[PDB]
Design an enzyme around this catalytic site. Structure first.
Site, PDB file in Angstrom:
ATOM      1  N   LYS A 128     -18.101 -11.849   5.481  1.00  0.00           N
ATOM      2  CA  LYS A 128     -17.330 -10.911   4.670  1.00  0.00           C
ATOM      3  C   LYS A 128     -17.110 -11.539   3.304  1.00  0.00           C
ATOM      4  O   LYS A 128     -16.034 -12.079   3.017  1.00  0.00           O
ATOM      5  CB  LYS A 128     -16.006 -10.547   5.342  1.00  0.00           C
ATOM      6  CG  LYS A 128     -15.257  -9.418   4.660  1.00  0.00           C
ATOM      7  CD  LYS A 128     -14.099  -8.932   5.507  1.00  0.00           C
ATOM      8  CE  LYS A 128     -13.105  -8.146   4.673  1.00  0.00           C
ATOM      9  NZ  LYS A 128     -11.786  -8.016   5.347  1.00  0.00           N
ATOM     10  N   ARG A 138       0.823  -1.209   0.000  1.00  0.00           N
ATOM     11  CA  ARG A 138       0.000   0.000   0.000  1.00  0.00           C
ATOM     12  C   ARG A 138       0.858   1.259   0.000  1.00  0.00           C
ATOM     13  O   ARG A 138       0.547   2.232  -0.696  1.00  0.00           O
ATOM     14  CB  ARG A 138      -0.945   0.004   1.202  1.00  0.00           C
ATOM     15  CG  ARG A 138      -1.884  -1.184   1.266  1.00  0.00           C
ATOM     16  CD  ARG A 138      -2.923  -1.129   0.163  1.00  0.00           C
ATOM     17  NE  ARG A 138      -3.797  -2.295   0.189  1.00  0.00           N
ATOM     18  CZ  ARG A 138      -3.566  -3.415  -0.479  1.00  0.00           C
ATOM     19  NH1 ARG A 138      -2.498  -3.554  -1.249  1.00  0.00           N
ATOM     20  NH2 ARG A 138      -4.426  -4.424  -0.373  1.00  0.00           N
ATOM     21  N   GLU A 171     -14.637 -14.876   6.155  1.00  0.00           N
ATOM     22  CA  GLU A 171     -14.346 -14.212   4.888  1.00  0.00           C
ATOM     23  C   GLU A 171     -14.029 -15.273   3.847  1.00  0.00           C
ATOM     24  O   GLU A 171     -12.858 -15.552   3.565  1.00  0.00           O
ATOM     25  CB  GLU A 171     -13.196 -13.216   5.032  1.00  0.00           C
ATOM     26  CG  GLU A 171     -12.911 -12.416   3.774  1.00  0.00           C
ATOM     27  CD  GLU A 171     -11.869 -11.345   3.988  1.00  0.00           C
ATOM     28  OE1 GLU A 171     -11.537 -11.069   5.157  1.00  0.00           O
ATOM     29  OE2 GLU A 171     -11.376 -10.785   2.988  1.00  0.00           O
ATOM     30  N   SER A 180     -13.651  -5.515  -0.709  1.00  0.00           N
ATOM     31  CA  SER A 180     -13.459  -4.897  -2.014  1.00  0.00           C
ATOM     32  C   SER A 180     -12.632  -5.763  -2.954  1.00  0.00           C
ATOM     33  O   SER A 180     -13.120  -6.173  -4.010  1.00  0.00           O
ATOM     34  CB  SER A 180     -12.800  -3.525  -1.850  1.00  0.00           C
ATOM     35  OG  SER A 180     -13.700  -2.600  -1.270  1.00  0.00           O
ATOM     36  N   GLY A 181     -11.404  -6.093  -2.573  1.00  0.00           N
ATOM     37  CA  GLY A 181     -10.569  -6.925  -3.422  1.00  0.00           C
ATOM     38  C   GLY A 181     -10.216  -6.307  -4.757  1.00  0.00           C
ATOM     39  O   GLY A 181     -10.169  -7.013  -5.772  1.00  0.00           O
ATOM     40  N   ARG A 222      -8.668  -1.126   1.334  1.00  0.00           N
ATOM     41  CA  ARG A 222      -8.159  -0.117   0.409  1.00  0.00           C
ATOM     42  C   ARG A 222      -9.246   0.855  -0.036  1.00  0.00           C
ATOM     43  O   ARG A 222      -8.952   2.001  -0.394  1.00  0.00           O
ATOM     44  CB  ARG A 222      -7.537  -0.803  -0.806  1.00  0.00           C
ATOM     45  CG  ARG A 222      -8.061  -2.209  -1.042  1.00  0.00           C
ATOM     46  CD  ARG A 222      -7.108  -3.028  -1.888  1.00  0.00           C
ATOM     47  NE  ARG A 222      -7.455  -4.444  -1.874  1.00  0.00           N
ATOM     48  CZ  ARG A 222      -6.948  -5.347  -2.700  1.00  0.00           C
ATOM     49  NH1 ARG A 222      -6.069  -5.016  -3.631  1.00  0.00           N
ATOM     50  NH2 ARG A 222      -7.332  -6.615  -2.589  1.00  0.00           N
TER      51      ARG A 222
END
Lengths: 343, 343, 343, 343
Positions: free
Chosen positions: B229, B42, B187, B271-272, B303
């Site tokens: 998730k 990031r 998730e 989001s991915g 993100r």
């Protein structure tokens, strides 16, 4: 497996040679893999204080026995601390056993974890980080590993969740071991909690073994490069009905040949509390069964090979010869009663 | 649950209050749980070198926003290092979030392990020694945890072994968390890994969710004290066919309401790789669906909430007001598009 | 399902319209599908002999009711012999119901088959030749079908084998029905054999429903074109403690929303021996639940709609209007207590 | 089991004697169970019309052979229509075979049923009413039954649903047969649809057999009173590379010994279009394998025992002794191969 095989020809070949050489000529496995608490409990029977030095001394007596022990013992299971110790002369135990020709193995489970919503039955921890540990052990002169999964007979036990989780943990363990080059020793141990009989234990053992080998097939585990460590089909020790070696042998071979494939090179039996003489007689009767038995039935014995040794040792020196002979006699007796040649 | 229930009435009640309070009033989850490598990835986009001080500083700006952020963020997922980090004035980040009313959560998976005999399919490690970690986190002001399981869509993927192992790992994780008092966030992320279409991704997501909740029911996991998730049902970006927010929303709500029970208090979306505007519009269209939708659909964004903040920070001080406003605005926009009120 | 979908867009659409129209506006299902022995057992309570003529006459009275019954009854489940019977004139029973607006359905199972090695547990026969029968019924103005699978609560009941076999049989039945255009009505009925508890019945019902919908997902069954016919979580008549409508409703909706997806258009309840007043009150309490309830809860009632009708008929002539009024009263009461509007 | 066993000691013993006597001394199975369409297809190769009289005549020639055929054939599988035919005299075909010492068996499946949402792969019908049919056959001097389940190798074939459904159908069939006293012959046949490999066929066969015996253990099927009828691991006729008898043998036994328990008394192989000489050579190579092979490998041959017989008969009268000699020669050669003594 066509496009995505788990192992290659060389890995499969090496695993098969290791697994067969462990049980090549009626040889068995010395299970000197007791943990600190387990070894302390074993030492408490002869009034010996539990410490690392006592464990090192006794394992040195066990591993410094006459060189004609590769004719009765083909593999030795160890603990992580015990593998890296030294003898009095200054060489490693895993090298002393290697020059004798004995194959080396390591305990690879990290323990029990409660399974919520179930009657006191647990699953087995040790899977995370197992690949790196197995690679390190394979580098450090270890050729096979052992993993124990406990399944209990009680009210609503074993449940479907317990059987499924334990079988899948054993299968994932075995796949990791074979990927790292180690021969896995599956130990599905069925322990009775309440009162039961021989038929119930045989039925539960058949169910456990069927689920275990179904999970092993699901995880693409090479069956010719793995061993099985099952308990002999017996009853609770607090039961009036005492089962003769014939009835125990018939029950356990009947359970095994219904569920255990012929690809498995050998079935080494655990003790789980039987006396040394009873274990030897039971295994002799097992190898005298008229049933097919397409495997090499042998022994993976703990207390059974280390009961007279503890009594002869007493935590004192000058009893080295007595402890060595007490372990020699039991190893030779079990090797004789691993081919049906025991009187 | 007649004789061996997984939880008691108090534990079930507490888990339900925590899970509902995370998503009580359209609030979402800020996923500030990036690992060292993930946070370095990031930070690399704004020419800032990866170090423990930069990760401390950026999350320091993120957790020091105006107190009217509980109106948009109801929970924050952290990393193990970030939980124990401190503010510049000498206050713990978790305590800062607690006095703001934001619920605290922790990442609880230890990573991925290759699954042998599978086309690059992996299982998730973190199960051994998870009960002790979860108890320590619960004593440390952490109320929920997160666990990611990756399922890929490739040739002969996802296999039955991958689905079974990942679902059972998620279920065992959830049972451990609920036994320790933490709310589990399952998730199951179905990554494209190809150029498949919306129909196939929806089908695979339905299969994954059905298996996940079957495994959760098998392990006796209190569904009212868990969050889900899932990924939004999209297609591989390699494929040239785009999908409007209406098609994505219809596909994902269709996949969810066929497999996800109504007991689950809320579904927070990841989001991915989606942009911030795309994620906001997609979640708005999700919450505008005419389908039943018995849960509280929300966002668990990483993100997506920390992309304009990264671009406004730049690794330099005196731009922290822009970093806080780029995260305030985006969180407010997602909270607005968590109840179908976003234009 | 990408490359190999089970149904097409038209088939899915038609199944959804049929399933929703059965439960469109609080309407329920009249379960007049008693077999020859079952209908004889119900007739024996009013001292009338069991014969085909009496069965034709009573169902003639039931189907010759005022055309406003389409405001309370949305579907009628018939038997194979009753579907082809006549209304004493040149017009069939199925056409009598069709011009009344009521949807037509058929019983589609042949029944119990012993499951060896189980404690009196049975599986359901009807699968072989089901496609041809369903196609014939669809050509014969039948729009939905019903299949009942019985699972018992006893010592080692329900077993894993019984649960799996019954769930897979229900799923295969539903897939065949949807392939032929019929809406399947899954009836997983959990019957207690002994003195059970409300918590045990709720837990067993959740397990059964989770397995049933896992099997339905495995067989690619369109959930929006099927109905569920579960029993309310109640107590046996030998239970010491009585359960209020509030407690039964709580347990029932709690069991349903943890396992039944929101894709299922409606949940129509059976009776299983509960009185008509108790069934009406319990269904009203179910529809007054504060829980999400993403479906259209209604009734699929047998004796509950044909208890006062049998007592008013008595097998005699000219006692028709009493039967008409009793059936109308019960249907109106249940339709009122299918949306929480019954006092 | 402890409390609810599937069979008793007498039933288990009788099933064991029947299953072993079928394969007692290298004897095989004559699979003269072709249906009306199948027998018509086999008759069409010699330009004779398909009719009941032609089938009666050819079955007469097959069953009117010298009484020394009990030294090569231990069981004959018949069709329902064929079992009740006569020997152009007072005696029935079944009694003619019974006084010859040959064990009698019956085909017991109704056949393919499309499995929706799958790539052209079916399940097998025959389960409803199987108990009554099996009881009637046992009263009618039939001692074993046969059931065939077809699984295809194609794109996404075999799927998990197909494998599970076929294995569970075979297990339910076997449990019903053993409850009625018949020895079940499981025939999991894997047919390739396309261009496959020997490794892929071996892998798919291993998965099929592992699932089949897991299902058999799940349904409590006595493994010592059942037979297996697998196809040899071969290649399709469109395969570029031909596989020698040694390679086919190894692949078949390698697949068998990893999945088939030693409790199964014997494994009788089918043909599947493989020629009469190739079947004999492959079976001899299988019985010459150095692998354990704890079973009694033999043949359950159809066209392989009835290809020279069809060519010698031709439908004409007085061409009987040629058919007798051809069938005798094929049976003797296949028995020699089943003992591994065929040169």
């Amino acid at each position: 497996a066509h496009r995505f095989p788990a192992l290659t020809q060389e890995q499969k070949k090496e695993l098969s040679e290791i697994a067969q050489s462990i049980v090549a000529n009626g040889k068995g496995i010395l299970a000197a893999d007791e943990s600190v608490g387990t070894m302390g409990n074993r030492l408490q029977r002869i009034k010996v204080e539990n410490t690392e030095e006592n464990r090192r001394q006794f394992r040195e007596i066990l591993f410094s026995v006459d060189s004609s022990i590769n004719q009765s013992i083909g593999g030795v299971i160890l603990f992580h601390e015990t593998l890296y110790q030294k003898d009095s002369q200054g060489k490693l135990f895993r090298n002393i056993l290697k020059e004798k020709g004995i194959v080396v193995g390591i305990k690879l489970d990290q323990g029990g974890a409660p399974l919520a919503g179930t009657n006191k039955e647990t699953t087995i921890q040790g899977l995370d980080g197992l690949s790196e540990r197995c690679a390190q052990y394979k580098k450090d002169g270890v050729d096979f590993g052992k993993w124990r999964a406990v399944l209990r007979i009680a009210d609503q036990c074993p449940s479907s969740l317990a059987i499924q989780e334990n079988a899948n943990a054993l299968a994932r363990y075995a796949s990791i071991c074979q990927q790292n080059g180690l021969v896995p020793i599956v130990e599905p141990e069925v322990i009775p909690d309440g009162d039961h009989d021989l038929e119930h234990c045989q039925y539960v053992t058949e169910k456990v073994l069927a689920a275990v080998y179904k999970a092993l097939n699901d995880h693409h585990v090479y069956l010719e490069g793995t061993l099985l460590k099952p308990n002999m089909v017996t009853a609770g020790h607090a039961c009036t009905k005492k089962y003769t070696p014939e009835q125990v042998a018939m029950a356990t071979v009947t359970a095994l040949h219904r569920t255990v494939p012929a690809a498995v090179p050998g079935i080494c039996f655990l003790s789980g509390g039987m006396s040394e003489e009873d274990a030897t007689l039971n295994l002799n009767a097992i190898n005298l069964c008229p049933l097919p038995k397409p495997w090499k039935l042998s022994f993976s014995y703990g207390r059974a090979l280390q009961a007279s040794a503890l009594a002869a040792w007493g935590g004192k020196a000058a009893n080295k010869e007595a402890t060595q002979e007490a372990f020699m006699k039991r190893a030779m007796a079990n090797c004789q009663a691993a081919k049906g040649q025991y009187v």
